[PDB]
Amino acid sequence: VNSFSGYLKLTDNVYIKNADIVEEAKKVKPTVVVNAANVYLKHGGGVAGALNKATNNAMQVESDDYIATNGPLKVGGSCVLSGHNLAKHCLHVVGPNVNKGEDIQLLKSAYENFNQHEVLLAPLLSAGIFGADPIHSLRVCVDTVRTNVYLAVFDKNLYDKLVSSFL
Numbered sequence: 001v002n003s004f005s006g007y008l009k010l011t012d013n014v015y016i017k018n019a020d021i022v023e024e025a026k027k028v029k030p031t032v033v034v035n036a037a038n039v040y041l042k043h044g045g046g047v048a049g050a051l052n053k054a055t056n057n058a059m060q061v062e063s064d065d066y067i068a069t070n071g072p073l074k075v076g077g078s079c080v081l082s083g084h085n086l087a088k089h090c091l092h093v094v095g096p097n098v099n100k101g102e103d104i105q106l107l108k109s110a111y112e113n114f115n116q117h118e119v120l121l122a123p124l125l126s127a128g129i130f131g132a133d134p135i136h137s138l139r140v141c142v143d144t145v146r147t148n149v150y151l152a153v154f155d156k157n158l159y160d161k162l163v164s165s166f167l
């Protein structure tokens with residue numbers, strides 16, 4: 001049993017809810033919250049900007065130190081850092097950004113990072129301002145992630161479309 005409430009069960013291991021991931025993290029304090037990161041860990045907008053704002057910029061300060069030491073992530077790669085006030089850990093995962101012309105085949109590689117964690121609160125990778133089709137992102141998630149993933153979908157209209165169209 002875990003603390004996640006109000007989710008619709010899509011598969012054995014994938015659950016979905018219309019929720020603000022920031023507000024969900026603050027309530028649950030999951031072991032792992034996933035950030036929709038870029039390779040520079042520049043948390044300007046989208047899910048990353050919202051998560052970072054909720055940490056009072058402490059996520060960005062920590063991220064800048066990481067990049068200064070390690071250099072940029074790979075597209076499809078991830079980095080576990082602090083979860084600050086939101087979670088124990090934040091798994092920063094880089095999905096391909098279609099609005100930068102990145103290979104959508106890298107979305108499966110991105111989701112494979114989730115398999116290193118038994119339970120996660122996450123957004124749909126490469127959705128929103130990363131430009132991919134969220135229906136596609138949900139299909140790759142279900143077909144890739146084997147650990148237990150609780151997906152937060154901010155937009156109610158999109159949530160209802162994801163559920164209604166789910167095979």
Ligand SMILES: *c1cc(C(C)(C)C)cc(O)c1O
Binds near residue numbers: 078
């Ligand atoms: C973030 C990222 C990484 C790798 C997997 C080396 C990119 C390591 C690490 O300790 C971290 O915090």
